[PDB]
Write a protein that binds this ligand. Structure first.
Ligand SMILES: OCCn1cc(Br)cn1
Length: 129
């Protein structure tokens, strides 16, 4: 894409130790599956393209970007060592939205709907075997 967008977050690195856990399997098969297909998912399914959206200040304000497209790749490509890393990526994505946008903007209402579902699913994250 454009040189004026930053490179996306890392999704592949052979030097980083990887593991499959039952919790990470739940994050892919239950949590991401649930949020990905939601009516309000589409703004979150890829990195924010600040050029196409005409938001030249976006990456001046958001220095820790994350999106569900990146999380999906991280889960599908077994990038994580634990569930906490992935949960943190979801929380970063929601906080980016809340920091950049005004309360009650449509995108914030959309994030809030996804977050409510996320919270319900994380409350049922299974005990690690
Ligand atoms: O200011 C950073 C580069 N940039 C320009 C537009 Br439009 C979007 N990103």
């Amino acid at each position: 894409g454009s040189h004026m967008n930053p490179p996306p977050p890392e999704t592949s690195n052979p030097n980083k130790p990887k593991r499959q856990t039952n919790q990470l399997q739940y994050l892919l098969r239950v949590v991401l599956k649930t949020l990905w297909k939601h009516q309000f998912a589409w703004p979150f399914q890829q990195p924010v393209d600040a050029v196409k959206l005409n938001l030249p200040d976006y990456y001046k304000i958001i220095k820790t970007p994350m999106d569900m497209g990146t999380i999906k790749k991280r889960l599908e490509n077994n990038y994580y060592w634990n569930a906490q890393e992935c949960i943190q990526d979801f929380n970063t994505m929601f906080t980016n939205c809340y920091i950049y946008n005004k309360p009650g903007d449509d995108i914030v209402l959309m994030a809030e709907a996804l977050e409510k579902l996320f919270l319900q699913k994380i409350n049922e994250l299974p005990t690690e075997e």
